[PDB]
């Protein structure tokens, strides 16, 4: 499981990146929010996620809130 920073989130649209020091930037749908409630996100953020790859590319999946 790795940790990393909401670099930024469209609450509107559901999408943003997470950056992590080391890797590239990673795309977070709202989809891949853990948690209760509605799920976003806000810059500054810190998040625990996996990174889940398809024929589309990586994308963060399991995000969960806090730190």
Not at 6 to 9: A, P, Y
């Given at each position: 499981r790795l940790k990393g920073k909401?670099?930024?989130?469209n609450s509107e649209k559901g999408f943003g990146f997470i950056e992590v020091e080391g890797q590239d930037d990673v795309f977070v749908h709202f989809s891949a929010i853990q948690g209760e409630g509605f799920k976003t996100l806000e810059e500054g953020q810190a998040v625990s996620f996996e990174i889940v790859e398809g024929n589309r590319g990586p994308q963060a999946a399991n995000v969960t809130i806090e730190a």
């Open positions: 909401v670099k930024w989130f």
